[PDB]
Write a protein that binds this ligand. Structure first.
Ligand SMILES: NCCC[C@H](N)C(=O)O
Ligand SMILES: NCCC[C@H](N)C(=O)O
Ligand SMILES: NCCC[C@H](N)C(=O)O
Ligand SMILES: [Mn+2]
Ligand SMILES: [Mn+2]
Ligand SMILES: [Mn+2]
Ligand SMILES: [Mn+2]
Ligand SMILES: [Mn+2]
Ligand SMILES: [Mn+2]
Lengths: 336, 336, 336
């Protein structure tokens, strides 16, 4: 009656992937909400596996390299994340989905690396306003949260500078294993690489012309045609329109409505193949108090959908009956 | 040229159906707006029939019974409402629609009861994020605004505790006479009853997959196949997304857009069978000043649509002409 | 690779077309944004042609005439605008689109007049919540921004009072050359004239039932069947929902989403016939600081789309390569 009867929860408070302080508070924004309560009420046993501690070096230990900011903090954090995620997914080897709350999106290199160690044939559904696939020398910002996929994609490795501390970050994805939904702010070099290597992608223009139902179907067709593969769902909260998720560092107008976001998560959940979902780029230090509440609320609804919550309702585990209590009903009285 | 040339307006400031003070100010939020002016400008004669005075007992006179809060205030108020609504609909027996502004949604038991006395074969279109069909012993809150339909539905009467003061509240609806649109927060026991008794329902998931045009058509097909029946349109303002109706007590993200709400009302109005429309759960004491204005504005647009306002425009009652005023036009001058 | 490789930019700070001070700051709201930077980054050469100075007479020199407010300021401003626009379009005779930022919508009489002098067979796509086609004696407000099209439409000239200072304002449009998208607040006499003279129009009701993709196709079919005609795109920011463009003087709920607005502009741009786009009714003096930022942001996204910005990405002008820098890649290292 439930596709997933248990799940794990993990916080990853990355904040060295981008300059705005506050993504480290993402996991707590969700712990402080009613998310856990709501999940239990649907009958799912959710275990809080705690937080990963990111490695945050000082400036002297972690100077710019190839224009990257905090690259050694990134490589060390990536390996720590991957080890923990691999551990969790293998103890789990009705499957047990891992729910990850960030943290800026640079965490994805580690979560996918570790996940792929447990499930080498996985596919990735990347829900984001951005491509997050800049190679280091094409990045205008040097911000790691804009590069996480590039280190993972085999076809891109002639464009990644070699670094000794990156050796353990082994590319584990083929371009054919990734699909994007929600794109609306690609850098020119990302567009070039995505098209050159045939990465499946559905931008907001595609969502407008095709409708979200067809986009979801086509994205799943592209990377998981017969639902044979485990799914890594990487959901950047900034994929959603700023009107519903204002508290995030790189907001872009004209995004997915909450309902469109829910449909993506509902369909992914219903495949029975949801293996990891991560939710990135929440920043409770951005915007007004009401902004933060709106963002928290959207995130909670999204994560609930991923775990199988149905907007059309759920049936009670036990159906209550008046007579059992020794109470007289209207119908009964009307007989007398 | 108009489907309805006159209408009645009635306030019902119920506030004992739920804990948040302020729904009693709903009717005044609409009187203070330009609603009456706008309706007259479309050529409709709208008569303000005043307010019903709810019965509000003190705690000593109205203790909890079967976990219900303010249940005797409810039964007495229900009967007072029904008497007044029946009176209005029978003096009205181009039909004359009654527009009712609440007030929390507990008023619906009385409005439908009285309406059905005048028109026994009516159907109900219930636009709401919530089912409002909890039976008393399944209600977690004890709030009457979450139970109004259960006392009316014949099939549910073996689940309603008998109470002497409820005797005059006679179930007047079959499950086959009700259709929901907009649902997204059903309690488990509501889901059970709705499915068990075959109540037609279209949740936000249905709206997403089918589109609002198909949902409206299917809802009308389910309960009013050949437009033979009078329609009771019960519209909870919280059916609309919180972004357009923030000032309401149980807001739920991912609701109907204003345009989707307008389409429901436009199609219902155009059947020629709109007999009662009630608008529930406005609370001007919730949210910011701008929040209240947004909510007031949405409500006004909704009610105008119900009465036949057309977004594609209306023709003038008398067409003005330059010559009649003894004024020289450009065209005329250009001849000389 | 680009449909338009250069464009001109012109400010028109009209504020005598309506009573609310602040539309004169519209052009500066756009100059202060990153619009110019973003346009250059797409490879378009955009030349700032400065501002037109409106003629603003004092009350004594410009009394009401036929109920019109500031009508002589309007006629003189109209002729000044037309002269400048004609000049620009003829020096331009890959075409070079002119981008105009207002300023209240009364400027349209002049921009279209001047544009038509350069391109007599043009068509007009009018994106607006309002018809802006009231003739003077039917206008309840006397506000010129509600009348700009009436002076231009040949079929309406028997309803325009003759005024000596209006002689040079020659009607240059047939009713068959105009299509509206986005309408939701037509005055009765506008509805009469639009229907009587067969002006193509798609209201928000049409957008709801047909979808924006079909509306755009039908609007272009109506006035530019084989893409033979130059297009004058007149975009009132109030066509967009108040949730995304709050800072404007006559806001109406239930408007186009930003995405729907983008689709209109993308399709118009892609015809290769975009000759003038004007963006009207920005008022930075209305609403909160965040309101103004939202409005500025929507306007920038809209104007970028008009010039050919693609949400699905653009290719780099030069593709960067690691080796050129004498840098060692991961792929290369892995061979050694
Ligand atoms: N995660 C936001 C990424 C923004 C930009 N593409 C970058 O590379 O920084
Ligand atoms: N009207 C809101 C109802 C919320 C909940 N279903 C309840 O029974 O109270
Ligand atoms: N531009 C807003 C126009 C509003 C009204 N139709 C008028 O004629 O003033
Ligand atoms: Mn992003
Ligand atoms: Mn991202
Ligand atoms: Mn409700
Ligand atoms: Mn309700
Ligand atoms: Mn307008
Ligand atoms: Mn306008």
């Amino acid at each position: 009656k439930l596709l997933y009867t248990s799940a794990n929860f993990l916080g990853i408070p990355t904040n060295r992937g981008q300059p705005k302080i506050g993504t480290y508070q993402g996991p707590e924004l969700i712990r402080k909400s009613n998310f856990f309560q709501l999940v239990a009420e649907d009958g799912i046993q959710l275990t809080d596996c705690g937080d990963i501690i990111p490695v945050e070096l000082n400036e002297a230990e972690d100077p710019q390299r190839f224009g990257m900011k905090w690259s050694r903090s990134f490589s060390l954090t990536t390996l720590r994340i991957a080890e923990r995620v691999e551990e969790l997914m293998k103890q789990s080897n009705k499957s047990t989905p891992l729910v990850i709350v960030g943290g800026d999106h640079s965490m994805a290199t580690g979560t996918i690396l570790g996940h792929a160690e447990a499930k080498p044939d996985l596919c990735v559904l990347w829900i984001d306003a951005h491509g997050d696939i800049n190679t280091p020398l094409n990045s205008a910002s040097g911000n790691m949260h804009g590069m996480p996929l590039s280190f993972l994609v085999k076809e891109l490795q002639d464009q990644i500078p070699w670094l000794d501390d990156f050796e353990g970050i082994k590319p584990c994805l083929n371009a054919s294993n990734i699909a994007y939904i929600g794109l609306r702010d690609l850098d020119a070099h990302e567009t070039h690489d995505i098209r050159k290597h045939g990465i499946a992608y559905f931008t907001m223009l595609d969502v407008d012309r095709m409708g979200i139902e067809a986009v979801i179907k086509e994205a799943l067709l592209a990377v998981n045609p017969r639902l044979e593969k485990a799914i890594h769902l990487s959901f950047d909260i900034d994929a959603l329109d700023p009107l519903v998720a204002p508290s995030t560092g790189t907001a872009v107008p004209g995004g997915l409505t909450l309902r469109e976001g829910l449909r993506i998560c509902e369909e992914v959940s219903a495949t029975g193949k949801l293996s990891v979902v991560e939710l990135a780029e929440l920043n409770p230090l951005l915007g007004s108090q009401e902004d933060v509440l709106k963002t928290q609320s959207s995130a909670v609804h999204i994560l609930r959908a991923c775990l199988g919550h149905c907007r059309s309702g759920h049936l009670p585990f036990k159906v209550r009956n008046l007579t059992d209590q020794g109470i007289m009903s209207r119908a009964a009285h009307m007989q007398t």
